[PDB]
Design a protein around this ligand. Structure first.
Ligand SMILES: COc1ccc2c(c1)N(C(=O)OC(C)C)[C@@H](CSC)C(=S)N2
Lengths: 556, 430
């Protein structure tokens, strides 16, 4: 049922030409499944049988998908798809539910085969030619030409989502506030009208459409209030995801842990509290999707700790442009943060989690402010505003990681919360060297190919030491040397460092790590009174390297 | 209702296609400000809607120029220039009057509205398409294409160049010594006259620019602690540089010297070959930090040599026009920042210390943007090219907040720092 809408001009990339093939000659019955459909598809004017003078072609799959009662075909445009020009992507995303409004009544209209109605430009039609030869080879050259947008074809969903944006336009103008949305084969119309009055606007629409060419048999708004939109479970006044049943096994491959890390992730939108850390922690082996990985006990400890919050269902509120937007962030440990966003207290709009990965030694204050951004970004992408932050961090420990940090940071409106796991500085180094305190010249060395280190130090009052190490990297060792040096000091100390690496890693004053080595330096720093970390260049005799690297000397 | 002129055929760079960048999500008030703008402009025949047959793109922002009242549109044409204008940096390039950097007082006028008259090529326009964003990805984009010359584009003043020479003519001879440079939508004007005398010399050009066409230099006004009364008067006469504040009172102790050995050891690959030995051997021992130790006899020959070598560089200043400047900024404190304009690492083409009050906003992402703008107008006056920045900031924070305190026409290319430098010690020219 061709539409009388302004068609769009399609072209093939310069230098190219339309495809040309000749398909796998079919027999009696299969051709009978094509002649029937095609010679009544032409009657409805979707195709047209143009014989000679057109040199191109394309194949026809006579695919009765599943096992239909009525025979169906499908012409594979794989070669054309390469040759045609580039269109603007319609799929510029997905309107995420958290930013949807409470539009009282809603309905969905099936614009499924509304692609074959919109017409294709009158010049391109030849590049969509396809032929079907007979069994007996008696009357060959049975070739049609597509009049409307064919299935699959690159520009189809492009041209459609644009043709139908022009079609709804006069309606939308005449009668606003009766908000429309569209995706592929759906029409999500909804307003603040009492059902019958809403049942009118729908039939008005259903007839404007029927007048513009595209038939829509959604028998009197034939679609129920509970919706399955791209996974999202939608109800006329709240949202969530309905089916999210993640099974368990006894010996699964990576192929299945990736689906696992998938669902738990997705569920993070609504279900307050969730972490997919340890489940993915071991996925390091980016091997084949057939190798089994004996899940750690800390992954089940999490998989189960998820299954509870996940079992008993959670609801989802909508947006109210007048009501505030305020978000808060809780520390869920292991360098994992979780946030919730509210207008009217407690009831949730959107929840989600931030977790720094692949690049350790990061600060908590820093990890906090990184999460805030992730959110400040997600806000503007959705609601169009920025959440007033509710944060578990003392101003006097924040402006000390604004005025003290190298990189520049910036968090908008934020207010102080109260929760046992407060975010703050556990320690802080000195700026001016300490008086009287013992001066520890530290040194550390290892083998580039013999891999057997040596730690140690020397003090301003002849107090030496060296703790031989094995299976320790030069980096680790330079680090181990300071810890050693930490342990042998009273309350306040001074430490001159060989390494810039270790220096710049202890300067940022971190806190968490899996490396017991760095965690152990941290612990010393936290209990110590006044710590001062100096630095002198290696390979240049600076400090005391003359006798300092003459003692920690290896056999190579 | 129109007046159709003639077109300069614009074509693409060595076998290239148009930019297909993506529209960064925008605030609400701003998406409202953009349609407020683009629709009147649509009525003005300047821009126009397209369909799917045009897959190209270019970012659109919103900025409140000078003072709060009305928004300005901005188009990150950074990719199209990269596409088209590196062949139009040749075929149709605008020469840089290298004396602009010496002229006592430079001023900048927004002569960007003058292009919106010149029609753009029927066959090229597609590559200037831009898209207006929607909140929460509800509705499909408000998709426009440029009919005339885009005010962002680096290939606009190149076209209007012809017309700009002809329109400025009467002034350039009535006022001969005045050096005028046209970079983008800007007209940099420089003389040897003092404030009072130059400020009117500019009004002169303004009125001349008014009469002779509808080219118009937008009204200038504002009042920050720093005098922002008349125009954006840059003074290329004060271009002197010595950020390296070597501690005169620091060689008293052991720790002071340990510091003094560190800064100096950088000036090694910067200033090829330096003598520091006689000083270093003074703390060759594992002594106490706070030990107030006097310097050795042959030590002064190490300090004062470099201390006088910190008064005259040599090769560095060599600007290769077939390469580009790199600007790297590093935070130093509450108000002060420090930059380095090099081109091939360690060879400093120009360094300086951006600053501001401690009793001011003391906002990091305000100073960073207002410093980025500075580093750049300076490099126009000097090199005629915008530097590649090496920013000390979170990629994603900048992407959010730059477009807020960015009172500026052009948008330089950028990069962000992953690691913590030792360069922000007291001040350091990398
Ligand atoms: C149960 O269905 C819904 C409940 C709430 C809303 C929606 C659907 N929304 C929507 O776009 O549906 C999906 C495809 C995103 C939109 C406009 S629907 C006319 C709004 S403002 N709130």
């Amino acid at each position: 049922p061709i539409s009388p809408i302004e068609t769009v001009p399609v072209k093939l990339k310069p230098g190219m030409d339309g495809p040309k093939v000749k398909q796998w000659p079919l027999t009696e019955e299969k051709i009978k499944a094509l002649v029937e459909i095609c010679t009544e598809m032409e009657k409805e004017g979707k195709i047209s049988k143009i014989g000679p003078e057109n040199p191109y072609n394309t194949p026809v799959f006579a695919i009765k998908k599943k096992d239909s009662t009525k025979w169906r075909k499908l012409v594979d445009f794989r070669e054309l798809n390469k040759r045609t020009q580039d269109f603007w992507e319609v799929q510029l995303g997905i309107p995420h539910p958290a930013g949807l409004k409470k539009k009282k009544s809603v309905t969905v209209l099936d614009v499924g085969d509304a692609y074959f109605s919109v017409p294709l430009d009158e010049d391109f039609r030849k590049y969509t030619a396809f032929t079907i030869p007979s069994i007996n080879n008696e009357t060959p050259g049975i070739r049609y030409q597509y009049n409307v947008l064919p299935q699959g074809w690159k520009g189809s969903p492009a041209i459609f989502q644009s043709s139908m944006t022009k079609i709804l336009e006069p309606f939308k103008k005449q009668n606003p506030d009766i908000v429309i949305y569209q995706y592929m084969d759906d029409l999500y119309v909804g307003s603040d009208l009492e059902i019958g009055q809403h049942r009118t606007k729908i039939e008005e629409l259903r007839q404007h459409l029927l007048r513009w060419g595209l038939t829509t048999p959604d028998k009197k708004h034939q679609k129920e209030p509970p919706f399955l939109w791209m996974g999202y479970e939608l109800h006329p006044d709240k949202w969530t995801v309905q089916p999210i049943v993640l099974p368990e096994k006894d010996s699964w491959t990576v192929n299945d842990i990736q689906k696992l890390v998938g669902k738990l992730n997705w569920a993070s939108q609504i279900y307050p509290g969730i972490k997919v850390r340890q489940l993915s922690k071991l996925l390091r082996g980016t091997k084949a999707l057939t190798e089994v990985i004996p899940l750690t006990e800390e992954a089940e400890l999490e998989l189960a700790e998820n299954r509870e919050i996940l079992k008993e269902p959670v609801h989802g509120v909508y947006y109210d442009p007048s009501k505030d937007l305020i978000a808060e962030i809780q520390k869920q440990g292991q360098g994992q943060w979780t946030y919730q966003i509210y207008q009217e207290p407690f009831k949730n709009l959107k929840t989600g989690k931030y977790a720094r990965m692949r690049g350790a030694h990061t600060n908590d204050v820093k990890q906090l402010t990184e999460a805030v951004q992730k959110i400040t970004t997600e806000s503007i992408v959705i609601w169009g505003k920025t959440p007033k932050f509710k944060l578990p961090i003392q101003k006097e420990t924040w402006e000390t990681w604004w005025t003290e940090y190298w990189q520049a940071t910036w968090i908008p409106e934020w207010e102080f919360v109260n929760t046992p796991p407060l975010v703050k500085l556990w320690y802080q180094l000195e700026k001016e060297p300490i008086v009287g305190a013992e001066t520890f010249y530290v040194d550390g060395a290892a083998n580039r190919e013999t891999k057997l280190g040596k730690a140690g130090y020397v003090t301003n009052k002849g107090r030496q030491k060296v703790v031989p190490l094995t299976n320790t990297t030069n980096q680790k060792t330079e680090l181990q040397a300071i810890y050693l040096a930490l342990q042998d000091s009273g309350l306040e100390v001074n430490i001159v460092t060989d390494s810039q690496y270790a220096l710049g890693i202890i300067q940022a004053q971190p806190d968490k790590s899996e490396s017991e080595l760095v965690n152990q330096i941290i612990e010393q720093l936290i209990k110590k009174e006044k710590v001062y970390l100096a630095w002198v260049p290696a390979h240049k005799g600076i400090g005391g390297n003359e006798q300092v690297d003459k003692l920690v000397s290896a056999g190579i | 209702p129109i007046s159709p002129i003639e077109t300069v055929p614009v074509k693409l760079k060595p076998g290239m296609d148009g930019p297909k960048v993506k529209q960064w999500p925008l605030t609400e008030e701003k998406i409202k400000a953009l349609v407020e703008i683009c629709t009147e402009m649509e009525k003005e025949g300047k821009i126009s809607k397209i369909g799917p047959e045009n897959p190209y793109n270019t970012p659109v922002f919103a900025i409140k120029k000078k003072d709060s009242t009305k928004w300005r549109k901005l188009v990150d044409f950074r990719e199209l220039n990269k596409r088209t204008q590196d062949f139009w940096e040749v075929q149709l390039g605008i020469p840089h009057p290298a004396g602009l950097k010496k002229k006592k007082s430079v001023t900048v006028l927004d002569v960007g509205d003058a292009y919106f008259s010149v029609p753009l090529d029927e066959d090229f326009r597609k590559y200037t398409a831009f898209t207006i964003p929607s909140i929460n990805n509800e509705t499909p984009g408000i998709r426009y294409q440029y009919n005339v010359l885009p005010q962002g584009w680096k290939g606009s003043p190149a076209i209007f160049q012809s017309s700009m020479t002809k329109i400025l003519e009467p002034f350039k001879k009535q006022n001969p010594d005045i050096v005028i440079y046209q970079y983008m939508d800007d007209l940099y004007v420089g003389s040897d006259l003092e404030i009072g005398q130059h400020r009117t010399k500019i009004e002169e050009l303004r009125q001349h620019l008014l009469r002779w066409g509808l080219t118009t230099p937008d009204k200038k006004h504002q009042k920050e602690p720093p005098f922002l009364w008349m125009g954006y008067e840059l003074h290329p006469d004060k271009w002197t540089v010595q950020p390296i504040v070597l501690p005169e009172k620091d060689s008293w102790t052991v720790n002071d010297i340990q510091k003094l050995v560190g800064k100096l050891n950088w000036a090694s690959q910067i200033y090829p070959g330096i003598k520091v030995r006689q000083l270093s051997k003074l703390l060759r021992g594992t002594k106490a930090l706070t030990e107030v130790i006097p310097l050795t006899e042959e030590a002064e020959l190490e300090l004062a040599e470099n201390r006088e070598i910190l008064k005259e560089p040599v090769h560095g200043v060599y600007y290769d026009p077939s390469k580009d400047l790199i600007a790297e900024i590093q935070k130093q404190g509450q108000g002060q920042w420090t930059y380095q304009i090099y081109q091939e690492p360690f060879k400093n083409l120009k360094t300086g210390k951006y600053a501001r009050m401690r009793g001011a906003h003391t906002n990091d992402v305000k100073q960073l943007t207002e410093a980025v703008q500075k580093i750049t107008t300076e490099s126009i006056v000097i090199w005629g090219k915008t530097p590649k920045f090496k920013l000390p900031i979170q990629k994603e924070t900048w992407e959010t907040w730059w477009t807020e305190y960015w009172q500026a026409t052009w948008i330089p290319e950028w990069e962000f720092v992953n690691t913590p430098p030792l360069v922000k010690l007291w001040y350091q020219l990398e």
